[PDB]
Amino acid sequence: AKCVSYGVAQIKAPALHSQGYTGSNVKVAVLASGIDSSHPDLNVAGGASFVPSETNPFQDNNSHGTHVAGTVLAVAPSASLYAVKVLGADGSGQASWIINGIEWAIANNMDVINMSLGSPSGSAALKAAVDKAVASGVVVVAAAGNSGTSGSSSTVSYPAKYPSVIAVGAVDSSNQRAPFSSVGPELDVMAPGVSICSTLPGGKYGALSGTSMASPHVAGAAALILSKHPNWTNTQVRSSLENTATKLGDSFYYGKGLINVEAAAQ
Template sequence: MKKFLVLITTLFLLMVPLQTSFADEAKTQEKDEYLVQFDGPAKKGLLKAFGVQSQDIVHEFNQLPVYNVTLTEKQAKGLKNNPQIKHVEENAEAQSFAQEAPWGIPHVQGTEAQNNGHTGEGVKVAILDSGVDASHEDLNVAGGYSVFGDSPYNDGNGHGTHVAGTVAALDNNLGVVGVAPDAEVYAVKVLDSSGSGSYAGIAEGIEWAINNDMNVINMSLGGSVSSDVLKEFVDLAYQEGILVVAAAGNSGTWLGWFDTVGYPAKYESAMAVAAIDQSNNRASFSSAGNAVEISAPGVGVLSTVPGNSYDSYDGTSMASPHVAGVAAQVWAAKPNLTNVELRELLNNTAENLGSSFHYGNGLVQSFEAISY
C-alpha cells in the first residue's frame, strides 16, 4: 500500500511541472492567434491544462467546436499533438480583392429581370466585408454585425459599401442601381479600415450569417493559404442552405495555366467568380483555375462608396456581388429552389465564354435563369 501511495505521489509531482510549464510559458512568451477545433465536444478544461486563460480566448464559436485563441508556439504544438484536437492552425490574414474603378447590371441581365418585376425582394444577402455605410442615400441596410466590436455601418475602407451597391443599390433615381435593389443587405464587418482581416473573423462572420438565416453570403475577399477550419464553416453554411459566393482572386495566371484561385473561393461549397470586361474578355488580373465556376463584370464597375459618393473599381471583388445580386433576383422569382438547385441553374444558364479554366461556366445571366 505504501509503495502504491509513493507511486501515485511521484506521478502527481511529475505532472505538476508539466502543466506549470505551459502556464509559466504562456505568461512570458510571445503569442499569436490560432484557430483550435476539437474532435468532438469542446472542452475548456483541456485548453486550461495547456495554460490557456480566459483572456486568451478571443472568440468561442457555437456552430462548430472551435476557439479563436492566442497561444505560444509551444502551446500550439502541444494542442496539435493532443488526440482530442482536430485542427490547430494560425489565424491567417485575408485581404479585400479590390484593385481600382457598374455597367455590369444590364450585362448580367439584371435590368431585364428588373423590368419584368424581379428585384430580389425578401432575399437576405450578407456582405462579409469592411462594413457598409448605412447612411448612404442609395443603400438600405437591413442589419449587421462586426467581428471587431464596432459598428458594422461605418466603412472606413469603402470596399464593402461598393460591393453592397452592386448587389442592391436602390432604384430611386439617385446615383446607381444594383442588380437586386429590393434584396435585404446585411453588413457583416470582417475587414478593417485597411481592408485586412483574418480567417477567424471570416469564420465568425459566416457563423453570424448562419445564425441569422441569411440566404446568400458574398465574400469579396480571401487569402492565398487554405484553412481546414474556414473550409468547415463555408461547408456548413452551404449545408445549412446558404448560397456562398466568393471572389476568385486577383492573382492573374502565370503562363496561362497555373491555378491561382484564392480561398475561400477555392472550396467546393463556394461559387468562385472570375472577372470580365465589357467585351467579355477575362480581366488580366482575374485568377484562373479549375475552381472558377462563373464569371461577371469586374472592370470599371461603378458603385456606391461612403459619404453619398460613387466610384469605379476593378477586381473580382466587383464581379462576385453581381453573381450574389443575380442569385437574389432568381431566388425571389423561384423561392422553392434549394441553394444547390439555384447554383445549378445559374451555371446551366450562363453564357459560355470559352475556357472553363478562365471563365468557369461563363457569364451569369439573370433573366435567362428566371425564364428557364
C-alpha cells in the first residue's frame, strides 16, 4: 500500500508478512460501490455490476469501494480482488442488488466476501443468501454499522446482524470503540476503523472512518489466514479470528475484541 495506515500493524498483519504470508491465491469479493481499477495501486481480477444506473464495476463514483479494496490489499498484498457493485454513488443500493452480488460471488467461487454496507432492515432473502454463501464455504464479513448506540437495543446493520456473518465494529488507534460503531449481541470482532488512509478514485489517497473501513481489515486477515492454511474451512477461519481476538471490554460494545491475525494464523 502506498498510503501508510496504522491499522495494518494494529491487527498484527506484518507478523504474517514476515512469515511470508500475503494472501496469495485467495479470491476476495468487495461488495460496495465498485473499485477504481485504473488506480495504479490496485489490480482487480474480475467483477460485476448490479446497479442499473451505474453499469461499470471497475469505476467507483462513491469512493468507499476503492478505499475498502486498498485496505484488503494493505493487509493481504497478494489477494485477488473482485469488484461487485451493489451500491450506487450515494452509497445506497436496493436489497435485491446486494443479493444478486452475493449469488455472483458464490457462483464465481469467492473465498471471502466483504460487505462494506449495511441497512436498518434485511430480509428473509438476504439472510438466505449469506447463509448459502457460508454453507458453500465462503468467509462472509460485514461492517457492523455506523448507527452508534440505542440504549440496550442492538444497532447492528444487516447483513452483519445475521449469525452466519462476521459483524465487524470499529476501534481507533488506542482500541477505543469509535462513537459511530454499532453495538449489540450480534457484534463479533473489532478492527481499526478511524481515519484509515487508503486508495481513492483517480489515483488518490485519503483517510476515512467507518465500520466499512473496519470490515476489510478482517476480510484481509481471512485472506492471510487462508494463505497459511488453505485447507481450513470458513468455520475454522472464523473460529480462529474470534477465539484469538484481544479482549477489549464488554462484548455488547466490542464483541470478542480486536482481531489478532498473528494469533489467529497459529
